[PDB]
Design a protein around this nucleic acid. Structure first.
Ligand code: MG
Ligand code: MG
Ligand code: MG
Ligand code: MG
Ligand code: MG
Ligand code: MG
Ligand code: MG
Ligand code: MG
Ligand code: MG
Lengths: 48, 203, 51, 217
RNA sequence: CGCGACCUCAGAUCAGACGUGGCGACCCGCUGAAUUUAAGCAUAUUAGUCAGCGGAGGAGAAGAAACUAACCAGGAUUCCC
RNA sequence: GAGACAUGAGAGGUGUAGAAUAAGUGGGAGGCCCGGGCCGCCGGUGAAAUACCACUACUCUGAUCGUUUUUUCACUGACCCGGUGAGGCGGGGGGGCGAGCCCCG
């Protein structure tokens, strides 16, 4: 959190490590990063 | 960079975060039993820089050692003869508690090899170490070079012959003028070489 | 011990602060450089609170 | 205590004089002082090496060293034109008599001679030793060769067994551009010897009728 | 008021493996005396030795400098003079 | 709470003829008072007197706001003791049996 704060990248604390792991097709995963996204979900980002 | 952040954080042991974590983990290791198998390394950066890899065949054992000095095991505190040998209480063991932790881990799981060990919190009464063990018959370990040296038979009970990192630190051998006591390979090798008598054929 | 030495440096008893840091870390060289780094920290936070 | 403003933001080091431009605050002439700041003293011990320097100030409060030089350095005495008298007139001068409104404590540093001092404290009035004055050699006032301690006659001080002293150098009516080489003597003449005492550096106090804050470190 | 996912644990005559004990001349890790000598004896010596405990291999340990040095410098370990 | 702790801070003493003790490290024969001063001082040759300029700090100070040390009380969560086949622990809801306790009808 201090690192993402200082670099100014938005970060969130999700409730569930297994939920991250299941979206990345493993058992658990610690963190997940969003890089650049296609045009039709840029607006979904631009609210979230 | 993540492991570098964990490394700096674990050097900052007297910070409030780390002293909280150390106290709570010390509490739960105290509630567990004396010899215990961990499901994963508590300190992964320390374990990997000590040799551990996340493969099948590397296991981690948490060992608890009752800390303090060594008391002489003589009845009623009576050693016999020579006041220089009358000592009972303030005596100290020649090896470290970390080395005896590795030795207890090896003696229980005597079919594995002790690679190394590190510290995971003490107490006033106990000291908790984690010992990296290796199964030397897993294929994932003896079907891969750079690690089948520990499957070779000259490495059985490294922690009992004194040649892990902690046991080597106890043996006290190095290079230079600090270490003349062990200048033939070991202490009694040096003692033997400088206390034998070379009686040549032509003297 | 760093925070207690920082209190000593805020009250500006620098000889006492050096003797204290030397008692905690053991060596005069390490104590001198720890004292200069804590004094740098105090000066930085002081000018930050000033501006 | 101090003056009215009682503030300083400078360190006022020994590589500094740079102070004193409105010391004449009121209409009168300020009795400027000079002191020493010997700290760390043990009251139950004895210490020595009295200080006696020539402090070039040319002041208004001024005594002299004129008594008595009994017919030996006449060539040195008639340049300043002393009242040249005898031992019976020294009986008059001293405070055994009751003649005129004369300051019995006029000159404490009397003239260092080798003749009259043998017979001063036997037939004269003991007001010399109750007032605590003696024509000794501390004053370095031989006054026989050409000129040593006659024309200026600096106000002298002493290093007793006491902690703090206050002896006035006198008056100025001027700036400190002669003081910049007049006064750097106290710290060196104290730290030259007797190192079972306080260290080198400290401030100095100058308080008077009105003592401006000039605590030269 | 259930259904999943992970974590942390448990059980099994589960599938496949591995350790134990012996020998111990040499090797490694501990532990470790007293006789003796000091013309007594306590530090010292005997001796980090005997006895005791553990672990090996055809050798073992050590080993590629947080070294020696102070020179015009040498250059892992082991062994011999 | 107490304790020296950062500190501010009113406050001085006599063997005594003294204009209290005119006392402490200060001492001009008056800065300054109205173009006057003053407890006194070369005029008890005076405890070094001291009409004045009380810078070292004088039996030295009630307290201020801070950092630091100890005493008592309380809490539980480490730690300890006991019991048990870890069997009803802590808080909370109605008609209510009885005080009728209660605006009281
Ligand atoms: Mg002996
Ligand atoms: Mg089976
Ligand atoms: Mg004998
Ligand atoms: Mg004999
Ligand atoms: Mg005998
Ligand atoms: Mg043996
Ligand atoms: Mg065996
Ligand atoms: Mg080998
Ligand atoms: Mg090796």
């Amino acid at each position: 959190p201090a690192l993402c704060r200082k670099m100014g990248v938005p970060y969130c604390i999700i409730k569930g490590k297994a939920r991250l792991g299941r979206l990345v097709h493993r058992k658990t995963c610690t963190t997940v990063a969003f890089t650049q996204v296609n045009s039709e979900d840029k607006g979904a980002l631009a609210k979230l | 960079g993540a492991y570098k952040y964990i490394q700096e954080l674990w050097r900052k042991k007297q910070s409030d975060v780390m002293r909280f974590l150390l106290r709570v983990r010390c509490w739960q290791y105290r509630q567990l039993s004396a010899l215990h198998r961990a499901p994963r390394p508590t300190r992964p950066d320390k374990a990997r820089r000590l040799g551990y890899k996340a493969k099948q065949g590397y296991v981690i054992y948490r060992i608890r050692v009752r800390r303090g000095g060594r008391k002489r095991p003589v009845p009623k505190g009576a050693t016999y003869g020579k006041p220089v040998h009358h000592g009972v209480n303030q005596l100290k063991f020649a090896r470290s508690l970390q080395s005896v932790a590795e030795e207890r881990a090896g003696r229980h799981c005597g079919a594995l090899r002790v690679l190394n060990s590190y510290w995971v919190g003490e107490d006033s009464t106990y000291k908790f170490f984690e010992v990296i063990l290796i199964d030397p018959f897993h294929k994932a370990i003896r079907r891969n070079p750079d690690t089948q040296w520990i499957t070779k038979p000259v490495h059985k009970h490294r922690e009992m012959r004194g040649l892990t990192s902690a046991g080597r630190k106890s043996r006290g051998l190095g290079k230079g003028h600090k270490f003349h006591h062990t200048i033939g390979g070991s202490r009694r090798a040096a003692w033997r070489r400088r206390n034998t008598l070379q009686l040549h054929r032509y003297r | 011990y760093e925070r207690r030495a920082m209190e000593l440096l805020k009250v500006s008893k620098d000889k006492r602060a050096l003797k204290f840091i030397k008692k905690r870390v053991g060596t005069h060289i390490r104590a001198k450089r720890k004292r200069e780094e804590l004094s740098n920290v105090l000066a930085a936070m002081r000018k930050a609170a000033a501006k | 205590m101090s003056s009215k403003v009682s503030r300083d933001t400078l360190y006022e080091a020994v590589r500094e004089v740079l102070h004193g431009n409105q010391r004449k605050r009121r209409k009168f002439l300020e009795t400027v002082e000079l002191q020493i700041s010997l700290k760390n003293y043990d009251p139950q011990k004895d210490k020595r090496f009295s200080g006696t320097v020539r402090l070039k100030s040319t002041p208004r409060p001024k005594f002299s060293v004129c008594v008595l030089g009994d017919q030996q350095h006449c060539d040195e005495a008639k340049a300043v034109d002393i009242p040249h008298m005898d031992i019976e007139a020294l009986k008059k001068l001293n405070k055994n008599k009751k003649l005129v409104k004369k300051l019995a404590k006029k000159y404490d540093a009397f003239l260092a001679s080798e003749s009259l001092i043998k017979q001063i404290p036997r037939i004269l009035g003991p007001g010399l030793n109750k007032a605590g004055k003696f024509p000794s050699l501390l004053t370095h006032n031989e006054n026989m060769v050409a000129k040593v301690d006659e024309v200026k006659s600096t106000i002298k001080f002493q290093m007793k067994k006491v902690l703090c002293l206050a002896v006035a150098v006198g008056h100025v009516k001027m700036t400190d551009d002669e003081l910049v080489y007049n006064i750097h003597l106290a710290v060196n003449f104290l730290v030259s010897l007797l190192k079972k005492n306080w260290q080198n550096v400290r401030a100095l106090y100058i308080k008077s009728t009105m003592g401006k804050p000039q605590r030269l470190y």
